Structure 1
Amino acid sequence: SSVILTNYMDTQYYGEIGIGTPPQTFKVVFDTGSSNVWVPSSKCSRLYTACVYHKLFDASDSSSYKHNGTELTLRYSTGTVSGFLSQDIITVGGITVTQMFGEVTEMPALPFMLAEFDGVVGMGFIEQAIGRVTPIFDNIISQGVLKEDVFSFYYNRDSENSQSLGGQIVLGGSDPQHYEGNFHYINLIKTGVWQIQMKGVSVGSSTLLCEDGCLALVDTGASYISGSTSSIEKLMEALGAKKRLFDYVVKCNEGPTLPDISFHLGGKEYTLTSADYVFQESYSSKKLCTLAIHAMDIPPPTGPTWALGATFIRKFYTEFDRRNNRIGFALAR
């Protein structure tokens, strides 16, 4: 099965899922970085403006709903959400699955008022699941219908004409149509985490970063590529970038001349051109241009670690292999 994704300014890739009977529609981000499923709840206090601006699941309108009520809190790198568990059938690209998910009753204005989407569908392992809830992918696999025990991600560059798919997720395989050359895999380090060993990070003619090795979380739910504050501060000064709020910028006229950034993964340099990681929205020296890379200090046992998000995935088609506990990359097309 495939799920069509929408691309909002290269920073938000979301698809749709139906919940309940009849189906209640939601826009969600598919996050390989987490393992729970959640959407805003109709029981969410309207004092939270983000709940006023998003689709809300109403259990009282679903005849397939199954109550549970266990409270859970989901902590993500850029924000937190709180609520309770409920069970109901969920549709994902034609596949129907009974799923335990979180109904959110607390959703902070920042950052959710900036979300064009409603909720989240974690694509991570149960090991990372809060409340020890079974992940939606495991449940689909239990049906023993997917041809393969893997799922692929394709993130298109944002177009100006809404007739080009923003992105695509293939459940149970990959779409040859969106990648060329051969896949190149790297076995996962830790157990139950889409994280792999990174052999090095170079900025031009200097492997000035991650020498001696580091970790890399392949994160579909991340807009930018991220490293530890320390790593970023070093990379950024090597780029002549200045930190504004919590991200970096360069003088637009300087963006095109920025150097290549490479990530050594499983013996294979994955190179990002400046055109690949800078939002070139001008060429003026009188304007600032943002970089799709910022600091993100992820706590142990998963972090410290770099995180490869949409900036990276946009260039390299990614396949997440469950059976072989590995990740594969291939030139996107």
Structure 2
Amino acid sequence: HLTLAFKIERPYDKVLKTISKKNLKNYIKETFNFFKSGYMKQNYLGSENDVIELDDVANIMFYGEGEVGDNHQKFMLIFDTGSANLWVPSKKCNSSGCSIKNLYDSSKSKSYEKDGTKVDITYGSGTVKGFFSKDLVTLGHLSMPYKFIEVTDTDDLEPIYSSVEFDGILGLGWKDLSIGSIDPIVVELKNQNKIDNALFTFYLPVHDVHAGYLTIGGIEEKFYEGNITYEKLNHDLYWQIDLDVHFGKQTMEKANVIVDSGTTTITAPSEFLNKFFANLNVIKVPFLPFYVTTCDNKEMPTLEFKSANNTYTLEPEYYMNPILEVDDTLCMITMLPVDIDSNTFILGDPFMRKYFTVFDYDKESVGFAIAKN
């Protein structure tokens, strides 16, 4: 079973590009100290001028060995579990961002098959437009003709496009954003018997925050222990399921919970979480997408996510990290307020460091298991 190693970059890493570890630690430390004495009627959790943006919620998953065409054109791709599409920037692309990218040139590949259907597709960070083309897509030892989008306009994807070193996106979701008749490459791979099962899995090593492994086609026993329990999607087009969420005394019944290695933390509706934070004496670091308190905060509960048949937990040690100092004085809580509606949570990277996960198109479900390390 094909296993693609990918690299992960987080908002925290982004932060470190500009702030030194040193001053980031002191800024946070000196900030918390201020909170334990300063603004009495404090317990700061942000403001209209200090908000958590969606870019502060996303991890980026880079995989740079996929190829398009029978001549080995290489591209840096990022995985998106929210959509079915594959797209690469086209040689015909005249946008500014395209000048620094690996461009796809169909004239150099004798498996290219023209299609031409115009399309546009929108991501949270913006829209791109191009047209359909079909050619060999190679991923490791796997290769097959696959219909993808050749992007020619990326203007509406700025400033992200020119700021992030990726060429295109490979969809691990269900929804074709062009509302064309496109199947996710995983399903198509199954459709052409390139793989045993239309499913893929995520294994996120607890010891290496910058690494992840996507296995396509089957389940590797080496990634997990005990059994895998399945949960039926509550939606036709997203890796989303029903769970009762328990954050200590805080409870939400039958919440919508999206499972997404692409998300940097656990996310929760802002009221529910701000509340959660207001009891634990957690503060938001002003101007930074971080929430912190003492690593050994006595009150930090074990999160519980329950279904009819199963229970998943997330103990404090899985959602709390020492600000950078492997030495735990202050910790960030890997939870971020995100409002998609009144009911929706995301189980992002931290939950998946503990739980190995299976995304099964055939069974229309997400499988969960204790990850082996």
Answer yes or no: is 1:321 the counterpart of 2:344: no
The 8 Å contact of residues 19 and 91 in structure 1, kept in 2 or not, is answered as: yes
Q: Is the 8 A contact 2:240 2:259 kept in 1?
A: yes
Runs of 5+ unmatched residues, structure 1: none
Measure the CA separation in 2 of the matches of 1:260 and 1:111.
36
Match of 1:306 among 345, 354, 362: 345
How high is the TM-score relative to the length of structure 2? 0.73
Mark the structure with the bigger radius of gyration: 2
Alignment of 1:38-187 (within 5 A): 38-48=87-97, 51-77=98-124, 79-84=125-130, 85-104=132-151, 105-106=153-154, 108-126=157-175, 130-157=179-206, 159=208, 166-187=211-232
Size of the alignment, in residue pairs? 316
**Match of residue 280 from structure 1:** 322
Q: TM-score, normalised by structure 1?
A: 0.81
* Paired position in structure 2 for 1:292: 334
Question: Which residue number in structure 1 is paired with residue 60 of structure 2?
Answer: 12
Cα RMSD for the two superposed structures: 3.1
C-alpha separation in 2, matches of 1:126 and 1:284: 40
The partner residue of 1:264 within 288, 292, 305 is 305
Contact 1:256 1:275 in 2 (8 A): no
The equivalent residue for 1:199 is 244
Residues 105-136 of structure 1 show CA distances to partners (whole Å, capped at 9, x for unaligned) of: 21534434553443221122257663332221
Structure 2 residues without counterparts, runs of 5 or longer: 11-58
Q: Shift of residue 290 of structure 1?
A: 4.7
Cα deviation for residue 331 of structure 1 reads: 0.8
- Report the secondary structure of 2:126's partner residue: strand
**How many angstroms apart in 2 are the aligned matches of 1:118 and 1:279?**
32
Contact 1:260 1:271 in 2 (8 A): no
Indicate if the aligned counterparts of 1:236 and 1:248 stay in contact, CA closer than 8 A. no
Q: Give the CA deviation at 1:22.
A: 0.4
Aligned equivalents of 2:108 and 2:101: distance in 1?
17
- Displacement of 1:180 after TM fit? 0.8
Question: Residue 56 of structure 1: CA displacement?
Answer: 2.6
Q: 1:63 is paired with a residue of what secondary structure?
A: coil
Q: Deviations over 1:202-224 (max 9, x none)?
A: 23xx1x142x3211111233233
Distance in 2 between residues matched to 1:157 and 1:284, nearest whole Å = 14
Question: In the TM superposition, what is the alpha-carbon distance from 1:319 to its structure 2 partner?
Answer: 0.8
After TM superposition, the structure 1 stretch with the greater mean CA deviation from structure 2, 174-183 or 126-135, is 126-135
Which residue of 2 is the match for residue 248 of structure 1? 290
- Kept after mapping to 2: 8 A contact 1:5/1:13: no
Retained in 1: the 8 A contact 2:201–2:219?
A: yes
Percent identical among aligned pairs is: 28
